[model samples]
Target: GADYSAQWAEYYRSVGKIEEAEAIEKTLKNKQN
Candidate 1:
């Protein structure tokens, strides 16, 4: 399984960090530019 933006259910369930998933996920799209 992979984590992308709001798709970090596993991370949110285990860590409950919305900003955590969001911040890291932002990097993915940022690099695509």
Candidate 2:
């Protein structure tokens, strides 16, 4: 679920894709709410 997406967000961050990482992080926050 969101956990997997979090991993992907980190991956994106590692690759310098900050936008994609933020998008996934926002989605994770939405799911938390």
Candidate 3:
């Protein structure tokens, strides 16, 4: 299955969960690096 972490993070942000979104984003960035 395609990982949808980015979308999850965006949704989190849209729902006003900035910390959760940023945490997922940071995790994604680490994966890419």
lDDT of 2 by residue, 13-32 (tens): 88888787887777666555
- Quick one: how many clashes does candidate 1 have? 0
lDDT preference between candidates 1 and 2, better one: 2
Error of 3 at 8 (Å): 0.5
Q: Is candidate 2 or candidate 3 better by TM-score?
A: 3
User: What are the TM-scores, per candidate, against the unseen true structure?
Assistant: 0.29, 0.49, 0.50
lDDT of 3 at 25: 73
> Scored by CA lDDT, what does every candidate get?
0.55, 0.73, 0.72
TM-score of 3: 0.50
Q: Can you give the lDDT of residue 32 in candidate 1?
A: 44
What is the Å distance of residue 27 in model 3 from its true position?
3.8
lDDT of 3: 0.72
Kindly report which residue pairs in candidate 1 clash with one another.
none
Best by lDDT: 2
Write candidate 3's Cα lDDT for 1-33 as tens digits. Answer: 335668878988888897888877765655442
By lDDT, rank the candidates, best first. Answer: 2, 3, 1
